[PDB]
Amino acid sequence: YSKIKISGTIEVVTGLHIGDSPVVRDLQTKLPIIPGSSIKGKMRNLLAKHFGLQDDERVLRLFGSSEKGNIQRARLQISDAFFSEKTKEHFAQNDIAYTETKFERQIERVTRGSEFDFVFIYNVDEESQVEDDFENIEKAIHLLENDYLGGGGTRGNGRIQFKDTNIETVVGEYDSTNLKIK
Ligand SMILES: [Ca+2]
Numbered sequence: 665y666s667k668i669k670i671s672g673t674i675e676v677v678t679g680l681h682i683g684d685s686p687v688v689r690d691l692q693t694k695l696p697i698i699p700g701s702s703i704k705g706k707m708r709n710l711l712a713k714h715f716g717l718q719d720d721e722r723v724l725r726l727f728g729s730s731e732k733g734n735i736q737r738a739r740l741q742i743s744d745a746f747f748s749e750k751t752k753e754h755f756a757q758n759d760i761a762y763t764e765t766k767f768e769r770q771i772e773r774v775t776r777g778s779e780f781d782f783v784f785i786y787n788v789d790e791e792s793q794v795e796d797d798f799e800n801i802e803k804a805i806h807l808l809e810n811d812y813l814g815g816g817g818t819r820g821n822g823r824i825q826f827k828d829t830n831i832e833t834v835v836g837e838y839d840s841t842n843l844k845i846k
Pocket residue numbers: 830831832840841
């Protein structure tokens with residue numbers, strides 16, 4: 665019943681729109697946010713499509729499902745990803761813009777170079793499957809990085825990168841030191 669914490673940074677590589685059309689924002693700070701659901705759903709679709717080369721246990725067990733029939737609980741809890749303090753300070757001091765509005769309709773985007781702190785929590789529901797689940801999480805990441813988040817994907821927008829990923833057992837004594845994403 666251990667929990668493993670995956671934390672790191674999501675960096676924007678090309679303008680990010682998650683919804684004339686403003687980007688979604690934290691109510692508390694009015695700063696852009698990447699919702700966990702955005703991340704969850706995109707990683708699920710992508711990893712499903714990957715394996716599909718009728719659901720797959722491996723996708724189900726990490727992400728769960730809201731769909732008919734399913735009872736399987738998600739091992740992987742995905743937080744909202746928040747505008748990093750490092751980003752706020754740097755952009756403030758150097759008069760850098762963290763959003764910009766362009767014509768396609770009028771579209772707000774999070775600027776290249778903005779970074780968000782992210783956090784996944786992994787529940788060890790079945791000790792024998794941790795290694796495989798962690799390979800699959802990694803694969804999901806890589807697929808998201810060779811794809812896109814939110815809108816404007818096909819015109820090259822919404823490219824993000826994961827980096828500085830730290831793995832740590834925050835509940836229980838499960839030995840997670842061998843685990844690595846990248
Ligand atoms: Ca570690």
